[PDB]
Amino acid sequence: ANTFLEEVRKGNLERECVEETCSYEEAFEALESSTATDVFWAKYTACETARTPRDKLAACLEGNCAEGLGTNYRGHVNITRSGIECQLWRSRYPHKPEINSTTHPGADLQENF
Amino acid sequence: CYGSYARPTNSNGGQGVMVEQNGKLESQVEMQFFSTSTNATNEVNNIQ
Ligand SMILES: [Ca+2]
Ligand SMILES: [Ca+2]
Ligand SMILES: [Ca+2]
Ligand SMILES: [Ca+2]
Ligand SMILES: [Ca+2]
Ligand SMILES: [Ca+2]
Numbered sequence A: 001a002n003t004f005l006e007e008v009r010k011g012n013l014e015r016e017c018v019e020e021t022c023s024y025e026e027a028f029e030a031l032e033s034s035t036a037t038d039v040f041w042a043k044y045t046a047c048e049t050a051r052t053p054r055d056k057l058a059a060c061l062e063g064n065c066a067e068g069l070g071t072n073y074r075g076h077v078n079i080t081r082s083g084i085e086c087q088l089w090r091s092r093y094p095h096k097p098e099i100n101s102t103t104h105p106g107a108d109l110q111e112n113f
Numbered sequence B: 001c002y003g004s005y006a007r008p009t010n011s012n013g014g015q016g017v018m019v020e021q022n023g024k025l026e027s028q029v030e031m032q033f034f035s036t037s038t039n040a041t042n043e044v045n046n047i048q
Helices: A024-031 A034-049 A054-062
Strands: none
Touching: A024 A034, A034 A054
């Protein structure tokens, strides 16, 4: 955002929307891949507490750790705290989830992760 | 800035309104500090 003459130089997704509080416009401009754009947005949002420092935002981009209540987690662990198998979020077996893939598509709902 | 003047008051060329208070020795000049807002605007640590 700062260093006004940045909009004439080429840019770095990391030298605009990472090491600096950025516009989703410059984010949109730099991303275009609107799926990953939503991903980066989701990042930003969850990383709202990971805005600083820089390496914290880098880790929040890695996504292996759940931020706060766990909106950002994108790992491969699909097991409950006590070893019970996780039911498919979209499937109705054995429970029909009021809160499921249709209601939360932006969390990247995997098989049972 | 274009065309602005302020006559010297001190000996070695330092401007500043030397007011008088029990003697013109007094010459008030204050200091103000600043740090980076976006340091994080949030530092449990005492900001420098
Ligand atoms: Ca900038
Ligand atoms: Ca900018
Ligand atoms: Ca810069
Ligand atoms: Ca631009
Ligand atoms: Ca830019
Ligand atoms: Ca950098």
